[PDB]
């Protein structure tokens, strides 16, 4: 018998993850952001001045040097403020935000699309449908309407 | 038995101190009612305006309890001989 | 040589039709590969942090068979053949890894004909994705829901890594169970940070900040990152399928031409003989 | 009450003469 | 809510993603992204000689595994 | 044994201080009962209407204790001699 | 030795001040219970009806303590003299 | 030297006030117990049955310290004439 | 220097009032301990049995301190005249 | 009922002390308000300017209750003879 | 002036009622230390062997303060006249 | 009514204690303020400087209250006969 | 005027009670330190060696005050009359 | 009117008890300072160095308040009568 011709690599080792160090000095003034939908990113280690996220407990803001905190992201939007005062918003579908003390943010979602690519006409027709779903007595429709509303109401608030 | 009615004219003042020991406590009730706004406004700024009535309401009732304590402590200084 | 010459003629025409049919398959495959190579620009970024959660030192197999009670092996196979040596090498790895405690839920049609003939009773079922729609997060959620029918202690997601057009090698994701991952997470959050294996990252702050996170959210963390791992596995085997089929089709065309010059030499030789 | 306060009015008058009398000697 | 109803976190994220794809604008992005929500998948188990579907874990998100 | 019955009129007043000092404490109740509703409403705005009754209830049933503490410090100056 | 029994009438009232100070402290007990109900219902609305009994129970027991304190006050202002 | 034994009859009625100040401090305890049960069962409802004893068991003891504080006042007013 | 040894047979009682004010304060400690047990076991049910000894051991000495305070208060009524 | 009106001059002063003790209590509210501002602005730097008016207000009024409690304690030494 | 020395044989007791008020307030410290141990071991179960030394420490020394307070409340009744 | 003006010189020397009882409460405020600064700077160091002024402010004014309290306890000893 | 210098030989034994009422208040402010150590160690045990210097330092300087709150109560029974 | 100037010497000694009672409160501050520096230093060890100055500052000031309190309690026994 051929002594184990096959020796497959470990797929995790291909990703150059960050080495979480304890720190010995100064604090960064801009964070290194990574935002990843399903597999493809949208931003690869971009320099950012700030980032504002939404969670279940409530909204949150992330400047550089922020403490280590891994945490949910509630379905809502996500604001990214670059160094030049500009901004960029992103509707997401849940995920996780991993913040390091080294100014290295890794946000990993299931979807991420800007506000520019969302319209109010195609949303005002979905909102009342979600509401009528929440009013139809049945678990298989009420929860679907609740979830759709959980995502839509932030967009109704932010598009205005 | 013997009977001695005495009118102490200094105890119109000691009490005015004790009541004033309870005028500063509702300050907590004020700050707790503004602090909880800031936090609630830092977690959800969209909810920054429809919470604010309850902030002022709790501040007002706490300040009103302090004002009643003070109305005693002044009613216990000037109107009594 | 009437029968002989008509035999060579039919052979020639059959190969000339088989050539253009295979060429059509190659064109379709190029049209599906040039769409999905776009992933390469946008790769190696979403599990930048998942590994710190789930990665670990290389645990030997002969000890893990003892430590556990039911393993799981999820091979990502293809819905259609002509790939080359992806499915076969996966099966060779699995029957090299064969142990008394294994359970196989695969992904593809070609894990349904081979495995049941190789792995009779361990092999449970498979999962199928007709590739009319790009693969989703919820496909990997389906895969996780099929994985969680087994009371498994470890899941080896086998797949094919596209290192390049000429290199489609193997790869694995050794996912742990939840109720073991959590215990190891606590045990590693307590002790100091001393990496015990080169190439492994220090993640003690990760594992403390996770301790800061409630139970339901840690379960969601595990499920989310396992799903992203499964998803990258599916995407990589898709790209690798479309990158190996062109190779296994080009060598098919080489072999067909090698047959066709023989047919066209014997035809003309028989014809010349029949004239002489 | 009127009979109680009439003599009591003298009771205290008696008390104040004495108290001045005991004090203003020492005082 | 959806938790005690029995659906998992992943189905919930996929439902939210479907909604985002429902509302978002027409263009190459919707053309790209509805592919990440539309359902094509199955599970099949080979019986003694023939195939059969494992109808216990469904693909559609309105339903619950059983 | 001799018996001296003494009526100390000033003690009409000292206790009113001692009671007034316990008039500001319920503010920490009230404020908290509001400081919750903000934070709760920051945690789930859709419950903001289902929770205001259970806020006003504690508000009122703390101000009740405050008013029953103040009724003593007003039923001790003016009614007691 | 000499024996001077003395009855100080004003002590009918000073203590009623002190006892009145312990009527406002259970207000924190009521607020700490209603606020907890609010926060819990915010974190899990499905449980909003499973926790309401304990809210009323804790409030009632705290209010009963405050009421015993008020009994010692009002039963010390009037019936004693 | 001289020896004046005096028997004051108002200490019957002041200390009972002082003790009556301490009957409320167990209320915040009762409330903290019930509030903790609420928040815990919100965190994990499946434990709400394994936790209800230690809430109940945490009231009855924390309540007893009030009753004894209420014993003294009702053992210092009525029997100590 | 004229020596006046006064023995006040009422001060036996005021003390037992003051001490009673401190009998309720350990109640919040008892409830703190049970509350912490609840929140811990909610955070981690598997640690429900290992921590319960300390939940008992905190009550068992907070209550002991309150019992010593009550011993002082009751031993200031029945043994001293 | 023999009538002894007495003026205890030292009661000008003791009561002021009783008021001075209530001057430091609002400091905890001041600190709570500024602490809330800090923690909120950490939760959201972008809101750091929209919360500051709700601090200075909730501070100053909470500080006002420290002035009255002091004014009495200065309205009770210098003017009261 | 005239030097009137007085010895009040009741101050043996009144102050003992003050000291016994400060014997309960360390109970909240004990309970705090145990509560913190529970919450820590719920936060890090395998650290529950390395923290318990500090718990047992902070429980004892806190308690010691109470004992010292209690010592006075025993050194002020039985040995002083 | 018979008029006894009595001046208790020793009252120069008890209110000063009552004031000193409340000089330490603002220490809690200062500590809260610096503690909140530490926690916020932990959460976001880049806001630290932007939050450092308010901390200082919340220290001084709080502290200033204590100073006024302390001032009373120096104005109650050294100037009042 | 008339001049009475009165020496109360029992006050020695009352201030000790009031002083010992504060020996237990540092206890909560000691157990908070060890509680914080436990919580922090849970959040990061790697730092659990670098922190206990800042725990010890928060014990002695938070226990020594009790000593200076207690030594008075031992410097006020045994050296003074 | 009659004029009785009385000097109670024992008022050198009851007010120091109250001040010494107030010496213990700032401990709750000091710990709350260190207790923060631990937690912060757990959340951000890289900022463990830029927080210790603020820790020492808050501790020193919370201690200086207690130092002035104890200075009152000590300046009221030795120099005054």
């Amino acid at each position: 018998q051929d002594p184990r011709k096959f020796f497959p690599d470990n797929g995790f080792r291909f990703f150059d993850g960050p080495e979480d160090s304890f720190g010995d000095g100064n604090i960064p003034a801009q964070i290194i952001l990574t935002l990843t939908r399903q597999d493809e990113f949208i931003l690869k280690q971009e320099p950012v001045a700030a980032i504002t996220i939404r969670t279940n407990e409530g909204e949150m803001g992330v400047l550089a040097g922020h403490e280590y905190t891994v945490q949910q992201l509630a379905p809502g939007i996500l604001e990214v403020e670059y160094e030049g005062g500009k901004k960029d918003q992103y509707v997401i579908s849940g995920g996780f935000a991993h913040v390091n003390d080294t100014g290295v943010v890794d946000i990993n979602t299931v979807e991420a699309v800007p506000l520019e690519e969302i319209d109010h006409e195609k949303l005002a027709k979905a909102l009342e449908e979600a509401r009528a779903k929440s009013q139809s007595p049945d678990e298989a429709v009420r929860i679907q309407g609740e979830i759709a509303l959980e995502i839509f109401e932030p967009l109704e608030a932010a598009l205005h | 038995a013997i009977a001695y009615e005495v009118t102490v004219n200094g105890a119109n003042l000691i009490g005015a101190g004790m009541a004033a020991s309870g005028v500063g406590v509702p300050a907590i009730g004020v700050a707790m009612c503004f602090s909880s706004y800031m936090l609630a406004a830092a977690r959800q700024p969209n909810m920054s305006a429809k919470l604010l009535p309850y902030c002022i309401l709790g501040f007002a009732l706490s300040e009103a309890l302090a004002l009643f304590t003070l109305l005693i402590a002044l009613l216990e200084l000037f109107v009594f001989s | 040589g009437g029968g002989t010459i008509r035999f060579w003629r039919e052979k020639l025409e059959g190969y000339k039709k088989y050539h253009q049919i295979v060429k059509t398959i190659k064109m379709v495959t190029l049209a599906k590969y040039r769409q999905t190579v776009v992933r390469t620009r946008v790769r190696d970024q979403t599990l930048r942090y998942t590994r710190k959660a789930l990665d670990a030192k290389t645990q030997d197999d002969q000890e893990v068979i003892e430590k556990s009670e039911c393993l799981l092996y999820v091979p990502i196979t293809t819905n259609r053949g002509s790939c080359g040596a992806l499915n076969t090498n996966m099966v060779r790895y699995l029957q090299e890894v064969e142990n008394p405690k294994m359970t196989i839920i695969s992904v593809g049609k070609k894990a349904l004909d081979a495995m049941t003939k190789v792995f009779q009773d361990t092999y449970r079922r498979t999962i199928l994705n007709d590739m009319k729609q790009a693969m989703s997060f919820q496909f990997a959620a389906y895969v996780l829901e099929h994985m969680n029918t087994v009371p498994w202690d470890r899941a080896q997601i086998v797949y094919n890594r596209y290192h390049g057009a000429a290199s489609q090698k193997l790869a694995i994701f050794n996912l742990p169970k939840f109720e073991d991952w959590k215990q190891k997470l606590e045990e590693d959050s307590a002790g100091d940070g001393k990496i015990e294996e080169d190439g492994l990252l220090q993640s003690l702050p990760m594992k403390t900040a996770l301790g800061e996170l409630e139970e339901t959210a840690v379960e969601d963390f595990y499920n989310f990152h396992s799903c992203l791992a499964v998803l990258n596995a599916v995407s990589e085997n898709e790209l690798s399928e479309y990158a190996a089929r062109i190779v296994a089709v080009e060598n098919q065309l080489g072999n067909i031409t090698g047959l066709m010059q023989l047919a066209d030499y014997t035809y003309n030789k028989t014809r010349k003989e029949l004239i002489t | 009450k009127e009979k109680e306060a009439q003599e009591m009015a003298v009771v205290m008058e008696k008390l104040e003469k004495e108290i001045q009398e005991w004090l203003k000697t020492m005082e | 809510s959806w938790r005690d109803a029995g659906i998992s976190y992943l189905r919930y994220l996929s439902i939210v993603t479907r909604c985002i794809h429902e509302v978002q604008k027409e263009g190459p992005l919707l053309t790209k992204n509805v592919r990440f929500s539309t359902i094509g998948w199955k599970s099949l188990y080979l019986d003694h000689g023939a195939t059969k579907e494992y109808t216990a874990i469904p693909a559609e998100l309105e339903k619950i595994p059983e």
Side-chain angles (χ1 to χ4, degrees), chain B residues 48-75:
Chain B
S48 177
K50 57 182 79 60
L51 269 57
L52 174 46
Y54 309 109
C55 170
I56 65 175
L57 180 57
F59 149 75
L61 185 133
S62 172
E63 190 72 21
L65 292 174
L67 189 142
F68 301 158
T69 317
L70 190 84
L71 185 147
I72 284 157
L74 266 293
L75 179 77

Side-chain angles (χ1 to χ4, degrees), chain A residues 7-23:
Chain A
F7 290 127
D9 277 311
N10 197 332
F12 289 125
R13 294 265 202 289
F14 300 126
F15 311 90
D16 287 334
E19 271 202 343
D20 278 318
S21 294
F22 304 90

Side-chain angles (χ1 to χ4, degrees), chain C residues 100-119:
Chain C
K101 46 186 88 75
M102 70 200 303
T103 321
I104 294 155
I105 292 98
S106 52
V107 176
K109 291 180 73 67
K110 294 292 181 74
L112 198 52
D113 316 329
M115 300 288 184
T116 298
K117 295 173 187 186
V118 176
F119 310 115

